[PDB]
Amino acid sequence: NAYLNLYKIDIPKKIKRLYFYNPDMEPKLFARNLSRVNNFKFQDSNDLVWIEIPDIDFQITPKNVFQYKVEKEEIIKEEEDKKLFVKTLYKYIKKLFLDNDFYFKKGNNFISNSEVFSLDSNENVNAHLTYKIKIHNISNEYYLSILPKFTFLSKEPALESAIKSGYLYNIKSGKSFPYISGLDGILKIDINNQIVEVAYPENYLFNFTTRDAEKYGFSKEVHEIYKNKVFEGFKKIPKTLGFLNKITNLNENYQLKDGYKIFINVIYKFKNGESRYAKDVFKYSFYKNEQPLKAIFFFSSKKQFFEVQKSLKELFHNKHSVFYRAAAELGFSKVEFLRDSKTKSSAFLYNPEEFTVKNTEFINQIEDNVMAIVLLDKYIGNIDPLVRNFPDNLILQPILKEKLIKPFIIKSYVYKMGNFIPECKPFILKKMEDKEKNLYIGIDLSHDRKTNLCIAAVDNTGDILYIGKHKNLEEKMNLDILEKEYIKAFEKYIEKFNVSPENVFILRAGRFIEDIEIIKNFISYNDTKYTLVEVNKNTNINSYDDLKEWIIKLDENTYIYYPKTFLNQKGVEVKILENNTDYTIEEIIEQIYLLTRVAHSTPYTNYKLPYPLHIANKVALTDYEWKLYIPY
RNA sequence: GGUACAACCUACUACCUCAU
DNA sequence: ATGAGGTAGTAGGTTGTACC
């Protein structure tokens, strides 16, 4: 039976507000004292001081305060105000952790001062057990999600710590400040460029960046520790967090009803067979191909041409090499290297600084679909100059000089070339074969006071029908923009298939803060079945059990799928907000999982999000970088 | 940059209650 | 306007495993 890090909150769902009256003291100062001492917040009214707490035995500090309490009490049910219940509950959780000697970090992370151990690679670095807490509302009930992670801080305070870092974390405050100096027993920090001497150097600790971890040699031990000792973090939850027993019973673990966890198996359809492995594209070729592979070379200078020419000719020019072998395995008609009439040399030169080639007759009158094999000396800071400056009507395939060998790198390179050709479909998903009718679009909003919107539309095979990016400023106007973009993608689908799609899938990153009834209205009154889906990759639900390639049903409306990846499993939550299509909810969820597999960047790696959403996000993040990795 | 992703620090924006 | 105190969501940018 699969374990899940969820614990039912067995307390009344109402929260009660209590009032205190102190005649001797000023009310605001009274609320300040009480607030500081109980690790809770007290709000002061005109004449009274009040606190909002959940319906549980909440012990006030100091006990003598009982005299100031009044019989007047207000009860606010969870039904009346859900937000107040949830936020008040978060406050009580934070108070419990603080009272039980836990450090507070941003994002509801709590560090342990007791449960620390010294790293083997570096004794001065201390590993702190840490827990991430979230409140989840499923099946009309409230559950608590607990995630074990580790926070790495210096073993001893800054002045007594051999290791030094850029910033410090304050145990009591819970905030981090830039470390200026630790001279002569006084530690100074920067808060706008304001420097002060802090009273307690022992309260401040050192936090570390990845570069610091590499510099001191414990960077790899961090990853080993995360993948390796996380299981103990799950096991010791009842013993270590037993103080949380007021709201929940930790000894009882959450039990998935039978049938609520289902494993999804994906089979890739190839030309002369089918498989469950992506790399088997090499065994069974491309679903469609029989296309010529035409490419030219670009070199930073003649010196690098000669320097890499040794491995270059053996890898690329002799027919018995792995490049031709792989290209034939993928079903290419032939491999041809274009030579220009000006020089019987198929290699061309570009300047690295501006990434521009001299305009030659050959490049201007080149055929449409050719690969520019561009060799890069090192990883450069910005690759936007390469995208903008390089010739427009040519598909760009950069490769690093250092990489030029591990076979799967070359094989992945040829696969990328295959993906960028419009006529070649590498594969189609066996289960997605009958989904030609459906149109899958993803919506992403990226902020920063102006907000930019991007959407993407794909079909069952994985072809990108349309991509739309807007960098306009921040209701009805953004829904007008969304309706025009949706209409444009609709028109692109009908252009591709000469039919209006009977089913449209709308997948949005995050929650629908935008108006719903308008969206469902204008999508629906074209008699096209629609489904509105909320996808959030920030979920706290996990387990020590392996959940990769599994779909878990929290409630009938909410599911969570874990994509297959080499690293620690992290779930993605999919929620069917509304559905009028012929598909059932289970089938729709399965389709969302399939959209992650409709396309592959390489045969060996997997996408975490559905392809429409992944494209929409990648386009929203960068203006010109996304052109390199997405064919459109 | 043949690539997916995890981790980490930093930072911002919005909002909330105070309040000069 | 602007400064506390707090919560929430995400972007920049470096390093790590993994694909054989």
Author numbering: 0 to 190, 192 to 404, 407 to 450, 454 to 479, 482 to 639
From the paper:
Argonaute (Ago) proteins exist in all three domains of life. The N-terminal and PIWI-Argonaute-Zwille (PAZ) domains constitute the amino-terminal lobe (N-lobe), while the middle (MID) and the catalytic RNase H-like P element-induced wimpy testis (PIWI) domains form the carboxyl-terminal lobe (C-lobe). Unlike other Argonautes, the Ago protein from the eubacterium Marinitoga piezophila (MpAgo) has been shown to preferentially bind 5′-hydroxylated guide RNAs to target ssDNA. Here we present a crystal structure of MpAgo bound to an RNA guide sequence and a complementary DNA target strand, providing insight into preferential targeting of ssDNA.
In order to capture a target-bound structure, we mutated an aspartate residue to an alanine (D516A) in the enzyme’s catalytic pocket to prevent DNA cleavage. Nucleotides 1–20 of the guide RNA (orange) and 2–21 of the target DNA (red) are ordered with a straight helical axis passing through the central cleft of the protein. The heteroduplex bound by MpAgo contains more ordered nucleotides, with 20 base pairs modeled within the duplex, than previously crystallized Ago complexes. Recognition and subsequent binding of the DNA target results in movement of the N-lobe away from the C-lobe to accommodate the hybrid helix. The MpAgo ternary complex shows that the 5′ nucleotide of the guide remains bound to the MID domain and unpaired to the 3′ terminal nucleotide C21 of the DNA target. The insertion of F410 between C20 and C21 disrupts the helical base stacking, splaying the terminal base away from the hybrid helix, while K279 of Linker L2 interacts with the phosphate backbone to stabilize the contorted 3′ end of the DNA target. The MpAgo ternary structure shows that ß-strands 1 and 2 twist away from ß-strand 3 to create a path for the glutamate finger to complete the catalytic tetrad. The geometry of the heteroduplex within the MpAgo ternary complex aligns more closely with a perfect B-form helix instead of an A-form helix. The 5′ region of the MpAgo DNA target (positions 5–8) interacts through the phosphate backbone with charged residues (K93, K107, and K174) positioned at the interface of Linker L1 and the PAZ and N-terminal domains. In contrast, the N-terminal domain of MpAgo does not split the guide and target strands, but instead the helix remains intact through the central channel of the protein.
